[PDB]
Design a protein around this ligand. Sequence first.
Ligand SMILES: NC(=O)C1=CN(Cc2ccc(CO)cc2)C=CC1
Ligand SMILES: NC(=O)C1=CN(Cc2ccc(CO)cc2)C=CC1
Ligand SMILES: NC(=O)C1=CN(Cc2ccc(CO)cc2)C=CC1
Ligand SMILES: NC(=O)C1=CN(Cc2ccc(CO)cc2)C=CC1
Ligand SMILES: [Zn+2]
Ligand SMILES: [Zn+2]
Ligand SMILES: [Zn+2]
Ligand SMILES: [Zn+2]
Ligand SMILES: [Zn+2]
Ligand SMILES: [Zn+2]
Ligand SMILES: [Zn+2]
Ligand SMILES: [Zn+2]
Ligand SMILES: [Zn+2]
Ligand SMILES: [Zn+2]
Lengths: 351, 349, 349, 348, 167
Amino acid sequence: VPRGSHMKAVQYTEIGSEPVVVDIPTPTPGPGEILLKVTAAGLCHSDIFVMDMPAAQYAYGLPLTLGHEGVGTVAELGEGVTGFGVGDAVAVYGPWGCGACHACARGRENYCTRAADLGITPPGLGSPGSMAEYMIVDSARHLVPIGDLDPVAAAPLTDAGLTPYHAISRVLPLLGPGSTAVVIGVGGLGHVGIQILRAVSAARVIAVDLDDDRLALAREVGADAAVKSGAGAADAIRELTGGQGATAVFDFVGAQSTIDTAQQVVAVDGHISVVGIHAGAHAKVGFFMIPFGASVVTPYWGTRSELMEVVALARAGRLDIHTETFTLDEGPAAYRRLREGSIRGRGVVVP
Amino acid sequence: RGSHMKAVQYTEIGSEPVVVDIPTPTPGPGEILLKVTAAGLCHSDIFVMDMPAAQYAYGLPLTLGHEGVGTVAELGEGVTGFGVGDAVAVYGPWGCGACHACARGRENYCTRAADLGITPPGLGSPGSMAEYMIVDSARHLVPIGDLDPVAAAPLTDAGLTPYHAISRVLPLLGPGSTAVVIGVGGLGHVGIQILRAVSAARVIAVDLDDDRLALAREVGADAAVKSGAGAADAIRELTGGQGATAVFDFVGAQSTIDTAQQVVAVDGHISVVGIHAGAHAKVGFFMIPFGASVVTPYWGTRSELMEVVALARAGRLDIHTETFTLDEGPAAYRRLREGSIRGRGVVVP
Amino acid sequence: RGSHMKAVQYTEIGSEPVVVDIPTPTPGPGEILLKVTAAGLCHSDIFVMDMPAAQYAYGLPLTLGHEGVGTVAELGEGVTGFGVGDAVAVYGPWGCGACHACARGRENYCTRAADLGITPPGLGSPGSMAEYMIVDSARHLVPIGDLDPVAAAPLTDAGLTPYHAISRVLPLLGPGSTAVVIGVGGLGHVGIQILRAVSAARVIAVDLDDDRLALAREVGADAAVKSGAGAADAIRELTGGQGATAVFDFVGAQSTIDTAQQVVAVDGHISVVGIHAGAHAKVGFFMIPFGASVVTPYWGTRSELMEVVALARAGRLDIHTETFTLDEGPAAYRRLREGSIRGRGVVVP
Amino acid sequence: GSHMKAVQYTEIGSEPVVVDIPTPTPGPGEILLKVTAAGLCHSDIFVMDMPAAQYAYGLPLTLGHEGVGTVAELGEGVTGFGVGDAVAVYGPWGCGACHACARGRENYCTRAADLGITPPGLGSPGSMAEYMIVDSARHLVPIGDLDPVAAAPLTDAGLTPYHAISRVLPLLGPGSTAVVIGVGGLGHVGIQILRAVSAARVIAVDLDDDRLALAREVGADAAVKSGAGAADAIRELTGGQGATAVFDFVGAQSTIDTAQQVVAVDGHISVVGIHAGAHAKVGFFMIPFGASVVTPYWGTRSELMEVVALARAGRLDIHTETFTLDEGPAAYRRLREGSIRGRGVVVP
Amino acid sequence: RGSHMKAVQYTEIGSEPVVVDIPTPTPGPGEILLKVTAAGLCHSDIFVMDMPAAQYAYGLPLTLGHEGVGTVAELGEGVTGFGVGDAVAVYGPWGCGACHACARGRENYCTRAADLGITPPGLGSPGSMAEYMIVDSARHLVPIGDLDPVAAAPLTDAGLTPYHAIS
Ligand SMILES: NC(=O)C1=CN(Cc2ccc(CO)cc2)C=CC1
Ligand SMILES: NC(=O)C1=CN(Cc2ccc(CO)cc2)C=CC1
Ligand SMILES: NC(=O)C1=CN(Cc2ccc(CO)cc2)C=CC1
Ligand SMILES: NC(=O)C1=CN(Cc2ccc(CO)cc2)C=CC1
Ligand SMILES: [Zn+2]
Ligand SMILES: [Zn+2]
Ligand SMILES: [Zn+2]
Ligand SMILES: [Zn+2]
Ligand SMILES: [Zn+2]
Ligand SMILES: [Zn+2]
Ligand SMILES: [Zn+2]
Ligand SMILES: [Zn+2]
Ligand SMILES: [Zn+2]
Ligand SMILES: [Zn+2]
């Protein structure tokens, strides 16, 4: 469906400004590229992060069509492109890579050692994004078929699904029967994390959050236990495990305090994944500051096969994110709502 | 036999060890008695003795020596698996044997060993630095065959420790990968040898000492650069700016840990093997590459120990030893303290 | 404790088992004595009893029962790490404890056991189908807390055996995988449940009996196929002709293996878990997809058994029991022959 | 199940939250109850309104000092209760071996401070959880087939007023007059108690006319609106002779002032209501001769069994509003805004 | 003593009985649990085994043996009229106890028994061919004193049936 010549989009146009709707030219797919008609485009707290970057630290980028969480159908194929038919429902894999280094050749393109130098950026974070009537994707490599899954349900999974899934997959061998996984932060990512831990592992899930509401929600989504986050959370958790320390801690908050709890509750030979972002917050990995053999990493999005697996969980009804639907023209309005945390789960814009 | 034996002991806090006379122990049921063939020293024996009285609970007196090698002297009851006169190495980090971690083969990460007050020989249990010692269980004995006991003693630590640190991420270290070893002291020295024997990875060494760097090349580092402010850059120049798959910090200083974070590749790995009270890696967004994982590993597994012995017997590992007598325990520790030992000190009674 | 006990025993080749009187055994040093709380019986008991005299060296008489649970009755000398009256299940496949294989977890694959004549209880050593049982080492007992010993018993084999077979290729069984289970009889039943619990793969059940199929659906199979010459194409129909990531053949018959070679995916896996003397996969070019690997797993590891226990304690494994009495031992073995027992038979003194 | 929901106070100045904790195990001498009702009370608000400054060694804390449940498992050696038995939890635990306790006045134990014997839900695990530990058998009183929901408030709002009255019951012969200040809440169970255990005249005093009218229906022989006109009003009703006993459940300086002006010679003032700072002023000519004042504390075990007996004989009725355990923190909010009719009770 | 017990059941249509080893029943309120002393076989228990899937209206499994004699092992709650160890024969054609026909002793002609699903021991209820047995009520036990159980068993049908026919 390329028909248009002109298309609607939401762009970040000026540093520190709010995003604005625009009428820009309808792109045309070059050789090797695919042009999608967008069916859903996701908001994310990551989006405010980049728009909150100061003018001092700004080099290049603008204008920028936002939206890294992209779903659509195939509109027009570029030269030489096969492996998709016009109409095929695809999700846009976010973390673009060179395709040619060792990492990309193992599926792990989110860890491409070349994207940096070659200035390969993801859609809606340096490349034209999903929040528009149409979109370009650089390679068929970056399309995952979703069949008849509702695009509104798919969009949030390209991040809120993939991100935690990758975090969990890094250590899924250690999450055998009898293991214990602590999920800190039952917001967007932690919500879907629990659902995941339930599908792919036999581990026992203990949830940690601030809000009382978030605790009972956690139990409903498959957490076997829930404690309140603070100075007391460490003890609270240990109490439950019979003082055994937890196999894996997935910290989807990523605050200093939450990292600190993670360290206090992680098992010997365990693992801590710092998934959420609070600038400056870090784990302190040194002797007698963390159990022996306890590994810590800040992982980053996910691999292609992982996103493929995410969709399978979705299609099998195993994942479910609370989704609230908006309109291209309400784009700015939606981002405003995001800033005030007046959205449960995930805002999704539908051209 | 004899009902008395010479032993080196840490007897009072903040004091130097001393040659003492104590009774020759007798092997309970399950236990094994060894005649010690070789008993190693390392700076780890120094780190413990430098704990202040303020933090002293219930340790002393303590026969020193975690690096244990010997020959089977007398089987306790029911023990089989070794005939008397068998050469065995004493596996260090003892565990319950019954927890999940122990049943996976990773005894060094036993979840109950702390609770049950199970401590390793020379760090809480009678050490190897004596004429005889008891091993609680035949589970903690590795046959070494005709391997030289003096050779084998360093390997129980200086061999096993780095082998573990490496094994943790050995799938990552395929051809085309770069591994950086910081601290070509005792551990680093054997680290390099292992890296060469078990992987095709490129090895870049980092150290303070010119001479250490030269010897790093000899044992098989492709390149060597000086530790310091500019070591990060130095490494990147060598790697065309690509950054290293794995970094094995055997120094463990804040400086080194810092260097390691500046040179680790995305999705790579840092392994903080050296102890410096208070030095830590800061793992957070934009303070380290995505996917780079950090860990402080602890000694090694029993299977690991067996593999180290195998490398040694095939002639693939090699550390310079300095041989002392029981009565030189104190002497040797002092030499160790001034760092006038190249490689590893080994007591032979 | 009395000087007598009964035991079900195979006393002569070709014979039937008999309830017999024999000395109650006493624990030596390192041994544990158990009051048997349950003693499961499986088809492989019938397998060994069917071996002819022609091929026979030694072994008689034999207390039957390789699936055993009990309570600690008396501790041998020097045996700590277990209270009297503790409920414990007995790790089946004993090994040396000192070989590389054992030092890793994988005792079931011990390289020495055959040479030192270390046989499993019920298969060359005093079994569980008796009032009292000797276990050689502590490391062969797994705590079961308050799990029902009658539930526990089939888990030591009908649980352990599939769990291991699946564990071997569990990383292949992510979302979107298909796992095929041929045989829903006893082992196969618990396999489905395991797959549901430790993976997210789709489960396709295959059997000869339609009532077993409908119960395979109950425990979590996403599809049922009838075993036969029609089974292969039907499985392909289910998978849109993509093939199955792994095929777990718990039947082990030539027709089942043949079925498996057809439906298995490229880079897939076949686990031949059931025994039919002679049945064998034909792994060679164009007779099986490229990268499809085949294995005959043997039983399982201590760590796995611990995990199998955790599942049951958490409610995720439910095998149907039919209990008999110690006197009824031979009766049950007759009932087992005529496929005449629902699920797993357990004897209970 | 090896864990259970529990309504806990986790950090000073915050709201309570339903968290998951280990289902405790009854030691030798302890009893495990499956809780069947847990009362909330304004006393619960008082404790969580204490500033961190005045806080040392409390948290976390399962709340709920008004407990009733069923015996779930008997600890070692504990004899004299059966599984399934319905019991109310005695609040103010004591040493059991000092004079005060040996007399049966556990609420007045002289060692309990020094032993850190704190009551359930005010320093020890409370009743607002699926299950409960009670330290010894002497702290359970059977309730038979009494509705636990009706029971629960009786462990505090029944016991507390009963003790207050019990202390001076000899003086409440026919012809005596008892004034009750503060009808809602404790004073509602007070009036009922007065009518059952005595034949005194009962004079209700409140601010809310609605509570006053329903105090009549429960056995108040007269009503008066609290204020600076309260004294005069009450004198008017006794012909100036004053009241034998004033039971002030409000506990304000205002109410205590009214009281001191209306009590009879050789009478008594029981200050049951807690208003920090509020105090009677007992000195010559600032109060009638022979008028005694006291701040009473909860009640005795015997007294509790008596309060149970009254309720089982249908002599005590208090309006309960049911909440769920999940609604623990929610209910605490409602109490905070005085929008609870009578006494709230959580049912796991 | 004995939480397990031996029994003989018809287990499914077409085939022949088997020696199943099922659980030892317990006497509910008003029931009596007997140690079986003798269990009779009859050409009755083979006419019921030759019923073709369709007609058969009992339900399996089915401990056989409607000719049953025993000793009082354990009394159920509030069951007076018998002591432990009393030698007793089992009255077969159980009835409601409440209808006119039952009120006259003729339980064998109970007009409710069919409708209320009351069925004779070993002919719809657990029978006598076992180590133990339950009798639903004390009214279905007839004392046999010192009569040889082996001799008594057949009477509960081989005697009673013609006796009634003749009476
Ligand atoms: N732990 C992670 O990888 C996260 C991935 N995203 C996308 C994203 C992309 C870029 C940034 C830049 O700061 C942050 C976040 C969503 C949540 C956290
Ligand atoms: N990183 C490790 O586990 C190392 C093993 N050893 C034995 C030992 C163990 C523990 C300590 C105190 O930490 C020191 C020494 C040798 C060097 C470091
Ligand atoms: N594939 C396996 O290892 C199985 C484990 N068992 C115990 C067993 C089985 C077969 C043998 C060889 O007779 C030995 C022991 C039960 C079924 C199959
Ligand atoms: N006057 C009393 O004794 C009261 C008993 N309680 C329990 C309570 C109350 C006050 C305290 C001190 O904060 C402690 C405990 C309920 C109402 C008033
Ligand atoms: Zn996002
Ligand atoms: Zn790349
Ligand atoms: Zn050392
Ligand atoms: Zn252990
Ligand atoms: Zn078996
Ligand atoms: Zn072995
Ligand atoms: Zn209260
Ligand atoms: Zn006292
Ligand atoms: Zn008959
Ligand atoms: Zn009738």
